[PDB]
Write a protein that binds this DNA or RNA. Structure first.
Ligand SMILES: [Mg+2]
Ligand SMILES: [Mg+2]
Ligand SMILES: [Mg+2]
Ligand SMILES: [Mg+2]
Ligand SMILES: [Zn+2]
Ligand SMILES: [Zn+2]
Lengths: 117, 908, 69, 106
RNA sequence: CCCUAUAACUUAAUCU
RNA sequence: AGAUUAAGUUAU
């Protein structure tokens, strides 16, 4: 069958494309796009200036203190408050658990989820 | 000593003699030279000048030299007139003309030069040889790039085993940038004074000061023409290796000031590229288009993309990639890509953009789902500190950590093999090929090997000649566009890439689209750029090293149109026997023998040579990949227009050269390299291989002392080779034919992807007339940014032994019937490891899949013709095990050795 | 001898894989490091030291019973 | 599953190395490590001991024969996480079960 | 979840 | 002898 499955993949692509603009909120995207001269921006600045969530993948403790020290940090000219930290097994790590001595007991890399302030 | 105080002059410099007495010193320096008696960029010996080194107040020696030239008297008057015309230019080294009693002979003293010229730095880096690099070490220690004990570290020069050498070479960068600015000032002085002449690199200091006015001719002022083609073109690899324009990324062009903060929304940069070209390359007379969509042919694309790769190192990395618009489809907001900003090709805008549509057909659903705009705009922001590569977005909330499991042990074959006597201590055949397992950090660690890909500028005049010689190697084939009902897709049950692998394999999208929808999508890509997403997967295979392999599956929207563009030419390449590119030639039925007899063809004093490409998929520059796709698309001269051919090139660069790469549920930016699952990757690697070999022969011939070439024909060939590279801008098709015939006579190549075997003339290579291994090391150093060690190369004197290694096979010359043929045989541990370790638990059955061992015994047949008895017992072990499985299952030919001897005899 | 210890490290990592060591990242990293270093060894003493250290992961969890086998 | 465990211990019996045989025989009698047996004298070794006959079969005094290696005992903890001294334990003190031993390589 | 592209070869089952 | 389908093997 080349039309039953064709309508099926058409419906699936419709579902996936209409799910995606429900994820984004157009409050920041329109003032990004209308600030452009010809309404045309790079893609690489869309999740940098619009996304409400940041994931930081950190391989070892020395990068963690130089990047995400404290419960808020600064990246991409924004301030982000840390919502969660999970490990390579995706187990929740407390922020009080990431220490210089406690670092071999953790399963590196750590994934720090932060929200835009 | 009375000659010394006249040389000292009024400058009040404390001078010691670098030579002895009043005699002329003898140095050994690199000169770019073009007479009617010699041509080339070679090291000669200069017996022309007396040198005097300058001491300081604490009599430590300075890098100031007083270089006093003895010559004839007409040259003295001529250079005095030219200097008096150009004495107020600050790019000119200060001169002092006098006459002395050596009998009266005239002397031209040039004051406060450096020890080395710019030609010595350019020769040091473009003819690099470790163990014979003294000028490079003296230049690096002199100008404070590193200390002298930096080189006591072994492999200090290696770009891969020591990536700190890029920081050292980048400390020569402001030196080279000041040299460029002084060349523009000297060219402006020559144009205002009315002076014509060729600017050569050996007449310019590392300080940047110019001299040697002995070939300059005066004309009317305002009408000076400086010839700067060989200058900039020979300088061009140093500009990216030393990163000379990094000061242009700072405020007011000052390395002490901060970085320029650009707009994030800015992507265009055409006026900034035009200003950079006006500042550093003002007298380069070929027109430069910052956006390569305005180019006139493919040589214009190469020429202008070579300036764009240099100027794109100044601009912010977030400005490159898919350019994105907001589109209302079905009254609904939507995000699509309407262009691309390429580092190499400038800004490309899509032509068929629809700002408003009510519904979406199946074609535009495919184009919008392949687009990384909707996936990146809907994802989270990602900051991945594991890798250096640029990170775009996290498509989900988790990071995927895929591992590789170990192999499955077939114990029955292993104890059958130790039953026959294999695997003893001190035996010649061991186990070295295993399924190495990997942990969850292996995919990103293999993605981090794209850090070997650096933005590399090419010698564009050399490259534009080499592309015509390389295109001569592809004249026999037939190419062009085909329709969608003429394509042949072999394995339809393979992955369709991201995001199409969520819904089916490639069978689904080749069945769901019409032929007319496929033709419409192909017609769409000749006018618009579709960026796609390449998915990285870890390969579960057997190997000798524990390095994890990744494959790069390309999405179906790219593969479907690239088959339609390239498949005619690729099927024509793969169906040709007796050619240089031997893709498609079988090794069975006498095919290996015919390939080796074709490569041996009529070379006079034949030696075999074979080299290595370290990190070939990762470290391949973008200019050579664009060059390879242009060489492939030179078959589309009738079906395709110029604009269609440009949009197909831009789709190849936006799809498999600098695409966005999904690696564990996260988009990253690929710097460059080859995608492994491109439609045309083996053939583009063959083009790249022939390109580097032709460049090696050009660099061998041009760096040879033309006074020492005893053949008159080879000497005139070297003269016209220099003329066709640097002194001529049309294509000289007679000389391309002549040089291609010279290469086919003395440098015979057998190329399959990166792998190659040349049969070369030994007397010509010892004289430096065809390339040798050192030439390949040099060419891969400055073009490919890798150090190819000679431990991974091989040469071969005896042609009755075959090549040492080609396509993992060794060669034996054995008596077959009444002839002597060349048979290929593999490493016996590779066949034994394929027997012992498998990847599926149902291949451990043995009684199921006898076919597996039949194929392995087909591969291990010529081991029976080997002198090693332990090598020859591998085929008999496979025969006896095939017989054992075939008997305890329940066609007797599978343990008769005649079925397998039939596979290596010419009667197909 | 060395072929035997390489082959049984292949079997040992395969049974540690199907026992879900891969659910712990910090353990599976050391297991694949020991497995890859056994398969690359040139002298059998190094191989047997790493083989002992890899078998300790199997015996260190109670999912096996050494009496039955 | 069980076929691969069976063939694994079949080829483990064939190797006939004394360290592997020591570890394998120890695991049947309840002498099982708590972590990875290390190849450095720095890292700590955590071995459970299930009874006193296994205790004097495994160690005598302060030194400890395990994995065909010598390890001086540094620390001993009984099941209720009370730090037990080396001179504290004997067969009369053994009812007073299984206890962990922390050692370092000699 | 996930396993690319190209080329060669073997076996089996079908249609001429 | 040619083609189609499926399984497998090698190379890059
Ligand atoms: Mg000169
Ligand atoms: Mg001169
Ligand atoms: Mg290689
Ligand atoms: Mg190779
Ligand atoms: Zn152009
Ligand atoms: Zn075409």
């Amino acid at each position: 069958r080349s039309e039953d499955k064709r309508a099926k993949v058409t419906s699936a692509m419709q579902t996936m494309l209409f799910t995606m603009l429900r994820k984004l909120d157009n409050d920041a995207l329109n003032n990004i796009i209308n600030n452009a001269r010809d309404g045309c921006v790079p893609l690489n600045i869309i999740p940098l200036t619009t996304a409400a969530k940041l994931m930081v993948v950190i391989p070892d403790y020395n990068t963690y203190k130089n990047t995400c020290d404290g419960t808020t940090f600064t990246y991409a000219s924004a301030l982000w408050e840390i919502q969660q930290v999970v490990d390579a097994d995706s187990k929740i790590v407390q922020l009080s658990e990431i220490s210089m001595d406690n670092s071999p007991n953790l399963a590196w890399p750590l994934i720090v989820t932060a929200l835009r302030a | 000593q009375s000659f010394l105080n006249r040389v000292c002059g009024v400058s009040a410099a404390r001078l010691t003699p670098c030579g002895t007495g009043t005699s002329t010193d003898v140095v050994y320096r690199a000169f770019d030279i073009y007479n009617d008696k010699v041509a080339g960029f070679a090291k000669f010996l200069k017996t022309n000048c007396c040198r005097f080194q300058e001491k300081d107040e604490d009599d430590n020696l300075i890098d100031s030299y007083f270089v006093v030239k003895r010559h004839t008297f007409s040259n003295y008057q001529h250079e005095e007139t030219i200097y008096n015309l150009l004495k107020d230019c600050p790019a000119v080294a200060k001169h002092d003309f006098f006459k002395f009693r050596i009998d009266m002979v005239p002397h031209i003293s040039r004051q406060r030069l450096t020890k080395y010229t710019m030609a010595d730095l350019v020769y040091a880096l473009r003819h690099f040889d470790e163990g014979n690099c003294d000028t490079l070490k003296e230049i690096l220690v002199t100008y404070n790039c590193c200390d002298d004990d930096y080189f006591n570290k072994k492999d200090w020069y290696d770009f891969v085993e020591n990536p700190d050498i890029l920081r050292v070479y980048a400390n020569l960068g402001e030196r080279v940038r000041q040299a460029l600015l002084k060349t523009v000032q000297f060219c402006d002085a020559m144009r205002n004074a009315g002076i014509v002449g060729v600017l050569t690199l050996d007449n310019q200091d590392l300080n940047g000061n110019w001299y040697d006015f002995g070939d300059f001719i005066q004309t009317t002022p305002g009408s000076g023409v400086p010839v700067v083609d060989s200058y900039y073109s020979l300088l061009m690899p140093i500009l990216t290796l030393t990163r000379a324009l990094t000061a242009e990324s700072h405020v007011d062009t000052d390395l002490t000031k901060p970085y320029i903060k650009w707009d994030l929304l800015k992507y265009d940069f055409t006026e900034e590229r035009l200003k950079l070209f006006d500042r550093y390359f003002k007298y380069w007379d070929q027109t430069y288009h910052p956006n390569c969509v305005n180019c006139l042919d493919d040589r214009c694309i190469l020429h202008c993309a070579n300036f764009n790769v240099l100027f794109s190192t100044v601009f912010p990395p977030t400005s490159f990639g898919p350019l994105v618009r907001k589109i209302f489809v079905d009254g609904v907001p939507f995000v699509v890509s309407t262009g691309y900003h390429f580092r190499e090709l400038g800004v490309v805008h899509n032509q068929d953009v629809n700002l408003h549509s009510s519904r979406l057909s199946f074609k535009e659903l495919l184009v919008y789902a392949a687009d990384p705009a909707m996936h990146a705009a809907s994802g989270n922001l990602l900051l991945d500190k594991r890798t250096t590569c640029f990170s775009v977005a996290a498509l989900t909330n988790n990071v995927a950590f895929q591992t590789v499991k170990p192999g499955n042990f077939n114990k029955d074959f292993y104890d059958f093999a130790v039953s026959k006597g294999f695997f003893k201590e001190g035996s010649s055949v061991e186990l070295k090929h295993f399924f190495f397992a990997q942990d969850g950090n292996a995919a990103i660690s293999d993605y981090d090997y794209y850090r070997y890909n650096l933005p590399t500028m090419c010698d564009i005049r050399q490259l534009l000649f080499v592309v015509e010689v390389v295109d001569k190697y592809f004249d026999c084939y037939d190419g062009g566009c085909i329709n969608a009902n003429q394509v042949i897709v072999n394995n339809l049950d393979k992955s369709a890439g991201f995001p199409f692998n969520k819904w089916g394999k490639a069978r689904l999208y080749y069945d769901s689209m019409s032929y007319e929808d496929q033709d419409a999508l192909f017609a769409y890509t000749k006018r618009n750029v579709i960026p796609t997403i390449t998915q990285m997967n870890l390969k579960y295979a057997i190997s000798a090293k524990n390095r994890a392999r990744t494959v790069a599956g390309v999405s179906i929207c790219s593969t479907m149109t690239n088959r339609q563009f390239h498949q005619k030419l690729l099927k024509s390449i793969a169906a040709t026997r007796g050619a240089t590119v031997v893709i498609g030639t079988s090794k069975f039925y006498g095919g290996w023998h015919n390939m080796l007899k074709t490569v041996y063809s009529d070379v006079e004093n034949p030696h075999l040579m074979g080299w290595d490409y370290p990190k070939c998929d990762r470290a391949m520059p973008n200019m050579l990949r664009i060059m390879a796709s242009l060489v492939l698309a030179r078959k589309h001269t009738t079906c395709c227009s110029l604009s269609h051919r440009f949009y197909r090139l831009a789709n190849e660069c936006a799809q498999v050269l600098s695409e966005m790469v999904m690696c564990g549920g996260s988009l990253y930016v690929k710097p460059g390299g080859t995608s492994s699952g491109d439609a045309t990757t083996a053939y583009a690697n063959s083009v790249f291989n022939i390109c580097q070999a032709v460049t090696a022969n050009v660099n061998a011939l041009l760096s040879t002392d033309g006074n020492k070439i005893a053949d008159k024909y080879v000497r005139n060939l070297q003269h016209r080779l220099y003329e066709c590279l640097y002194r001529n801008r049309d294509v000289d098709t007679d000389f391309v034919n002549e040089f291609y015939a010279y290469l086919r006579k003395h440098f015979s190549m057998m190329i399959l992807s990166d792998d190659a075997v040349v049969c070369f003339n030994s007397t010509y290579a010892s004289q430096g007339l065809v390339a040798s291994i050192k030439n390949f090391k040099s060419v891969l150093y400055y073009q490919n940014n890798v150090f190819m060690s000679e431990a991974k190369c091989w040469t071969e004197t005896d042609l009755t032994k075959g090549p040492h290694e080609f396509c993992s096979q060794h060669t034996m010359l054995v008596k077959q019937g009444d002839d002597y043929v060349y048979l290929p045989y593999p490493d016996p541990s590779r066949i034994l490891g394929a027997g012992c370790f498998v990847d599926d638990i149902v291949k451990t059955d043995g009684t199921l899949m006898i076919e597996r061992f039949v194929s392995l015994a087909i591969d291990a047949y010529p081991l029976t013709k080997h002198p090693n008895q332990e090598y020859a017992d591998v085929f008999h072990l496979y025969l006896q095990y095939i017989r054992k499985l075939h008997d305890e299952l329940t066609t007797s030919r599978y343990w008769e050795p005649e079925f397998y001897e039939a596979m290596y005899t010419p009667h197909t | 001898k060395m072929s035997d210890v390489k082959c049984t490290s292949v079997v040992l990592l395969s049974v540690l894989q199907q026992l879900r060591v891969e659910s712990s990242s910090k353990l599976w990293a050391q297991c694949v490091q020991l497995h890859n270093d056994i398969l690359l060894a040139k002298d059998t003493t190094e191989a047997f030291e790493k083989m002992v250290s890899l078998l300790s992961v199997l015996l260190s969890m109670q999912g096996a019973v050494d009496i039955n086998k």
